[PDB]
Scaffold this active site. Structure first.
Site, PDB file in Angstrom:
ATOM      1  N   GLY A   1       0.800  -1.229   0.000  1.00  0.00           N
ATOM      2  CA  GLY A   1       0.000   0.000   0.000  1.00  0.00           C
ATOM      3  C   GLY A   1       0.832   1.278   0.000  1.00  0.00           C
TER       4      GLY A   1
ATOM      5  N   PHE B   1      -2.160   2.342   7.882  1.00  0.00           N
ATOM      6  CA  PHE B   1      -1.357   1.518   8.793  1.00  0.00           C
ATOM      7  C   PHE B   1      -0.415   0.501   8.101  1.00  0.00           C
ATOM      8  CE2 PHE B   1      -5.169  -1.144   8.329  1.00  0.00           C
ATOM      9  CZ  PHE B   1      -4.778  -2.449   8.548  1.00  0.00           C
ATOM     10  N   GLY B   2      -0.719   0.121   6.863  1.00  0.00           N
ATOM     11  CA  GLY B   2       0.055  -0.871   6.122  1.00  0.00           C
ATOM     12  C   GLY B   2      -0.741  -2.154   6.149  1.00  0.00           C
ATOM     13  N   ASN B   3      -1.853  -2.171   5.394  1.00  0.00           N
ATOM     14  CA  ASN B   3      -2.804  -3.275   5.358  1.00  0.00           C
ATOM     15  C   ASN B   3      -2.391  -4.422   4.466  1.00  0.00           C
ATOM     16  OD1 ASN B   3      -3.614  -1.319   3.188  1.00  0.00           O
ATOM     17  ND2 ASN B   3      -5.323  -2.739   2.891  1.00  0.00           N
TER      18      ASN B   3
ATOM     19  N   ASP C   1     -14.892   0.346  -6.172  1.00  0.00           N
ATOM     20  CA  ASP C   1     -13.667   1.146  -5.987  1.00  0.00           C
ATOM     21  C   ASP C   1     -12.653   0.857  -7.115  1.00  0.00           C
ATOM     22  OD1 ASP C   1     -11.195   1.701  -3.238  1.00  0.00           O
ATOM     23  OD2 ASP C   1     -12.001   3.124  -4.703  1.00  0.00           O
TER      24      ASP C   1
HETATM   25  C1  LIG Z   1      -4.066   2.312  -2.812  1.00  0.00           C
HETATM   26  O1  LIG Z   1      -3.987   0.930  -3.244  1.00  0.00           O
HETATM   27  C2  LIG Z   1      -2.777   0.374  -3.253  1.00  0.00           C
HETATM   28  O2  LIG Z   1      -1.771   0.944  -2.933  1.00  0.00           O
HETATM   29  C3  LIG Z   1      -2.829  -1.091  -3.722  1.00  0.00           C
HETATM   30  O3  LIG Z   1      -4.110  -1.461  -4.226  1.00  0.00           O
HETATM   31  C4  LIG Z   1      -1.717  -1.315  -4.774  1.00  0.00           C
HETATM   32  C5  LIG Z   1      -0.561  -1.852  -3.939  1.00  0.00           C
HETATM   33  O4  LIG Z   1      -1.082  -2.010  -2.618  1.00  0.00           O
HETATM   34  C6  LIG Z   1      -2.490  -2.149  -2.579  1.00  0.00           C
HETATM   35  C7  LIG Z   1      -2.883  -1.778  -1.157  1.00  0.00           C
HETATM   36  N1  LIG Z   1      -2.889  -3.622  -2.895  1.00  0.00           N
HETATM   37  C8  LIG Z   1      -4.086  -4.335  -2.576  1.00  0.00           C
HETATM   38  C9  LIG Z   1      -5.253  -3.883  -1.962  1.00  0.00           C
HETATM   39  C10 LIG Z   1      -6.274  -4.787  -1.706  1.00  0.00           C
HETATM   40  C11 LIG Z   1      -6.158  -6.114  -2.092  1.00  0.00           C
HETATM   41  C12 LIG Z   1      -5.012  -6.563  -2.730  1.00  0.00           C
HETATM   42  C13 LIG Z   1      -3.957  -5.683  -2.969  1.00  0.00           C
HETATM   43  C14 LIG Z   1      -2.641  -5.828  -3.574  1.00  0.00           C
HETATM   44  C15 LIG Z   1      -1.968  -6.903  -4.181  1.00  0.00           C
HETATM   45  C16 LIG Z   1      -0.715  -6.691  -4.746  1.00  0.00           C
HETATM   46  C17 LIG Z   1      -0.094  -5.430  -4.771  1.00  0.00           C
HETATM   47  C18 LIG Z   1       1.100  -4.870  -5.381  1.00  0.00           C
HETATM   48  C19 LIG Z   1       2.166  -5.404  -6.104  1.00  0.00           C
HETATM   49  C20 LIG Z   1       3.221  -4.583  -6.481  1.00  0.00           C
HETATM   50  C21 LIG Z   1       3.215  -3.230  -6.162  1.00  0.00           C
HETATM   51  C22 LIG Z   1       2.146  -2.670  -5.473  1.00  0.00           C
HETATM   52  C23 LIG Z   1       1.093  -3.492  -5.092  1.00  0.00           C
HETATM   53  N2  LIG Z   1      -0.064  -3.190  -4.367  1.00  0.00           N
HETATM   54  C24 LIG Z   1      -0.768  -4.358  -4.154  1.00  0.00           C
HETATM   55  C25 LIG Z   1      -2.026  -4.559  -3.533  1.00  0.00           C
HETATM   56  C26 LIG Z   1      -0.242  -8.005  -5.232  1.00  0.00           C
HETATM   57  O5  LIG Z   1       0.822  -8.284  -5.767  1.00  0.00           O
HETATM   58  N3  LIG Z   1      -1.221  -8.938  -4.976  1.00  0.00           N
HETATM   59  C27 LIG Z   1      -2.385  -8.339  -4.334  1.00  0.00           C
END
Ligand SMILES: COC(=O)[C@@]1(O)C[C@H]2O[C@]1(C)n1c3ccccc3c3c4c(c5c6ccccc6n2c5c31)C(=O)NC4
Ligand SMILES: COC(=O)[C@@]1(O)C[C@H]2O[C@]1(C)n1c3ccccc3c3c4c(c5c6ccccc6n2c5c31)C(=O)NC4
EC number: 2.7.11.10
Lengths: 619, 650
Positions: free
Chosen positions: B22, B26-28, B145
């Site tokens: 994220g 908080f770092g979900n 969303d």
């Molecule tokens: C504001 O939203 C974000 O920052 C993201 O959706 C985008 C970011 O983190 C979130 C929280 N996210 C998520 C938010 C909610 C559900 C799943 C994710 C998520 C995922 C991934 C990644 C990801 C991979 C590489 C770089 C950034 C990545 N993110 C995710 C995932 C992933 O690899 N598998 C699921």
């Protein structure tokens, strides 16, 4: 700024003053010496006496007197003279590319022109007394620049003394030998870029040190440390060839002789024999050979009678290459003509060099060529310690010398390329005849295939229709048929076409493919900037920037030279294959020609034998 | 009580905890890496203390994820054994696959994507996200969303796969009421706090898609909701962009903005598909005139399944795009090119990259050779006019966008940082286009050169055959002339005592004068001169920078502007940038002049070659007859002589 009808006043030529005037109508140029100053009666007389001397004298190497333009209103008359378009010799000596002396051509024309003028003056009982580069002007001739003598008057102070014969500081009365000293110092300066005996040293100290030189010494200099060294030898760097350096070195000993009565005395031609001595040197006919094996230039004085065979025997002693193995080529890749004399190599102005009439030597024995100049004392001295602080005048000298070293690396490297191009030119000329012969061979083979095909057709009919009409004839005709089976050199031609085709590939790869040229331009500009530096900015410093450029040029040179020799050994192996193929092609064309002759005869004979059958049957 | 020097983040067996995925909060979502297998996972965890409603909301998400299974939807993975122990509460964790390509926002932020993504990247995005939304909506799930932050890129075997993430706002379906989502992609209805449907996800997909095409959002980005609602409300059914110009006037448009990296047809067809998706009316949104309500996915399917052919008219320097059918013949395409270029079918020389002419009777689809690196340049055909002898050295470079031509006219104008950021990116894009356009013209000149060299090759092969045939004919004629001269001499010699056949003598004398006329040596001679003079011009043609540097210069200047600290972001001119574009325009037209000079040199050689081929063919024919006749006349004479010997033998 001032006019006199068509005669319009131009720039000052130098300092009374000398000013150029140009005729708006005719395009004619004149130089006028004028004095607005008020003079003592002796110097007034001295002025008039000069105008009078000039008006009397007439020589191709002495500035001509001219009429003062009508209406050209102190009370002293004007001195009208010819305008010399080339300017003074000091200007030439100051050209940045002439810091380590003038080019060979420019030195030979200087020496010749000034010796001839001095000879005229001295025979007309005129002693110059102030001969120097400022008193030599260059006129534009039809094919070259002509040196002429000026100022036949009847740093600042140390400046005036620089070309004076030692006797002049010592006593009152003098002789023609004062002009020998001046000519010699001047000549040396044009060869080397600087004066022979401790330039710009104060007179008392100068006199005390130069007095100590031997009869054979032509140079007394101060090194960076500042050891005073005396030498019999002409200093390096200079743009003269091996023989010219050696011969002008000994002629200079005659001219730079301390003894006033002994000066100019030649061991052969006696007193005042220095002009006849130089005549010999100038009338020399030189031949320059570049041994491609070593990369060294051999210079040979030749006579109009000297045969190429005599020159070849002379090259043999210095290179170790026997006459039979000597491949002597010129710029355009032509081998030297044996019937013609050795002087055939010789093709005369300021732009003349040894490169003009240069012959490239190759060893026919060599299959491959392996890559095989020593910089002056001051250059190798600064190479060892480049961070050393040197005074501006010292910087000016070593930087010019370093730049000259790089120019030489560049020039040396280009001479090797010229040698490789001469061998390539010879190869391409041979490959041309080889192609012309290949085409003839191809064409003759196709014509033979055709005649054989036709004969085979003809004889098959004649054999069929004979046996149908039912001896010595049948067996003879059957021998004709099996005999023509053996001729036709298709398979032999085939192999030669493969070779000839594979060769032409290597040749197109050779002809279808600098920093050393760039490193020279960099050094030239750096030296240019140093010399064009304002007088207030002329301080102490390093040679780091310059020494950096030389090391890169040395590295670039040897890298470039490696590639030249790689292509040369590639060129020579192609030249061999070409020379190997020429007789093989010649031989097959011969065989084919006989095969045609045989087919033609055998056909004629059979036809005549058939008409013979018709005779016998008609009875 | 002591500080350890170890840097192991937190472990759970072979699984080492890595960074947060994220951006805020908080770092979900956090990445975990298996030290033993090298496997990567993403773990979504809820907030430590939850209200019973958000507890229920959490369970609903876990349930939806567990159900879902699609190639473009990040699937729920088994929670590694021992991790549920390190969870904030009794509620399960959401273990998911880790997508190495990263999120779509990261891609949109790459400085070379300021004026939108590349055409390949747009087609794979649209296809992957439409298929995922379709799966969700058919399984009665509404995302609520959808945005670039909720799209992640996975590394596939041949391309980057877009996948949908975050089903935390998603509802199982029907109408919804909840005020959920992201302001920036929030459908009008949600701000109006009305009841809504799946058409909320159409809005999000449409805004998102537009942002990927153009580099910015369709409707007044970063405007405050009240003001935004009041202005965007005023748009028509056909409006897909509401923006603020350099003079701050708010302008509405039906058209897709320029600059974009899409082709003519795709821009036109995606423009009208966006009107369906960016429709203010909530019930009417996504309704296709053919496929009815919710037919927006089938509409895009048509656009995506289009087979396009790109023709570069070398005369003008413009790219013509033609939607072609699997049945469409090259002749139909030629008739279509004819209308836009004015070049008749017969004069159309259609060539490809390697200089090969297009094959009639193969279909028009022969031009077509599919990932993010796919462009119109891949399956591009170059058009030449056979009528042309010389090509005009000037062709008029591309028309730059409204804002670029505006700043070109007045470069000393001060613009606000956000306005500077937009025009500078656009100027950089203009230079990149000059560079790309110029290289396509070189490719066209190289295709013509390749065709010339291929023709010159056959011409050389024919020349040698002709030369060889001529030498063989010269030889047979020489032989026949020799043969007949003997036969005529020895006949006349034996008339009185032997045989007198007046019919034979005249026949043989005709044979002799007949063979005098044949042999095409002098005709061959001239053709060898021409063929040789031609090959000279061709070697001179084949044996014979700042536009790329100007681009790198503009890229760095735009880079500097973007990486400028927030306090340093002030007003400014585009003098430095406009200077670079003018230099690029000047460099381009200079480079283009040279390309056309060599093209007109190439085409004159190609003409001479095509002129010589029949002349060679004709002479070889004549020579072949000459040979035929020599062979026959020789056979006949020989047979006539043996015939005399028959008569004499009786
Ligand atoms: C504001 O939203 C974000 O920052 C993201 O959706 C985008 C970011 O983190 C979130 C929280 N996210 C998520 C938010 C909610 C559900 C799943 C994710 C998520 C995922 C991934 C990644 C990801 C991979 C590489 C770089 C950034 C990545 N993110 C995710 C995932 C992933 O690899 N598998 C699921
Ligand atoms: C400072 O210059 C000198 O010392 C010169 O000797 C050298 C210089 O001017 C002087 C005064 N000079 C002289 C000093 C004394 C007599 C004649 C000259 C003189 C002459 C010429 C030139 C001249 C032409 C072009 C460039 C420079 C030239 N100079 C001269 C002549 C000329 O062309 N004809 C005569």
């Amino acid at each position: 700024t001032q006019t006199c009808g068509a005669w319009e006043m131009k720039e000052r030529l130098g300092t009374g003053n000398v000013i150029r005037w140009h005729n708006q109508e005719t395009g004619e140029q004149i130089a006028i010496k004028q004095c607005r100053q008020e003079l003592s009666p002796r110097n007034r007389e001295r002025w008039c006496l000069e105008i009078q001397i000039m008006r009397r004298l007439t020589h191709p190497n002495v500035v001509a007197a001219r009429d003062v333009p009508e209406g050209m209103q102190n009370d002293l008359p004007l001195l009208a003279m010819e305008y010399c378009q080339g300017g003074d010799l000091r200007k030439y000596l100051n050209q940045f590319e002439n810091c380590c002396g003038l080019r060979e051509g420019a030195i030979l024309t200087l020496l010749s022109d000034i010796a001839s003028a001095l000879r005229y003056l001295h025979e007309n009982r005129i002693i110059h007394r102030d001969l120097k580069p400022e008193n030599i002007v260059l006129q534009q001739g039809e094919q070259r620049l002509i040196h002429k003598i000026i100022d036949l008057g009847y740093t600042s102070f140390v400046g005036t003394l620089q070309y004076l014969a030692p006797e002049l500081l010592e006593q009152q009365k003098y002789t023609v030998t004062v002009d020998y000293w001046s000519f010699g110092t001047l000549a040396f300066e044009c060869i080397t870029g600087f004066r022979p005996f401790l330039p710009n040293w104060q007179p008392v100290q100068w006199h005390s040190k130069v007095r100590q030189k031997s009869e054979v010494d032509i140079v007394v200099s101060e090194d960076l440390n500042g050891t005073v060294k005396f030498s019999s030898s002409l200093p390096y760097p200079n743009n003269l060839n091996s023989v010219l350096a050696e011969r002008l070195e000994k002629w200079l000993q005659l001219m730079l002789m301390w003894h006033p009565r002994q000066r100019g005395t030649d061991p052969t031609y006696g007193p005042n024999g220095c002009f006849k001595a130089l005549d010999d040197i100038l009338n020399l006919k030189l031949v320059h050979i570049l041994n491609m094996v070593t990369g060294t230039i051999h210079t040979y004085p030749v006579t109009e009678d000297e045969s190429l065979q005599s020159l070849k025997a002379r090259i043999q002693q210095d290179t170790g290459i026997p006459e039979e193995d000597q491949e002597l080529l010129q710029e355009a890749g032509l081998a030297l003509i044996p019937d013609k004399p050795a002087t055939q190599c010789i093709s005369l102005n300021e732009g003349h060099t040894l490169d003009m009439d240069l012959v490239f030597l190759f060893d026919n024995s060599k299959i491959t060529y392996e890559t095989q100049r020593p910089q002056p004392e001051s250059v190798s001295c600064i190479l060892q310690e480049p961070k050393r602080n040197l005074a501006f005048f010292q910087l000016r000298k070593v930087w010019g010398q370093v730049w000259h070293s790089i120019q030489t690396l560049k020039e040396d490297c280009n001479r090797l390329q010229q040698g490789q191009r001469a061998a390539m030119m010879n190869l391409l000329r041979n490959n041309s005849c080889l192609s012309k012969m290949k085409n003839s061979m191809a064409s003759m083979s196709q014509q033979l295939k055709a005649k054989l095909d036709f004969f085979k057709t003809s004889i098959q009919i004649d054999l069929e229709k004979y046996s149908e009409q039912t001896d010595k004839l049948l067996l003879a005709w059957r021998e004709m048929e099996q005999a023509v089976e053996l001729c036709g050199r298709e398979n032999e031609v085939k192999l030669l076409v493969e070779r000839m085709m594979a060769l032409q590939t290597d040749i197109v790869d050779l002809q279808r493919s600098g920093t050393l040229d760039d490193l020279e331009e960099q050094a030239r500009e750096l030296y240019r900037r140093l010399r064009e530096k304002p007088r207030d900015q002329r301080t102490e410093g390093d040679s780091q920037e310059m020494v950096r450029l030389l090391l890169q040029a040395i590295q670039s040179f040897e890298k470039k030279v490696r590639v030249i020799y790689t292509q040369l050994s590639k060129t020579v192996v192609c030249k061999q294959k070409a020379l190997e193929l020429l007789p093989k092609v010649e031989e097959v064309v011969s065989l084919m020609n006989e095969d045609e002759k045989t087919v033609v005869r055998l056909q004629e004979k059979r036809q005549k034998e058939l008409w013979n059958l018709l005779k016998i049957a008609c009875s």
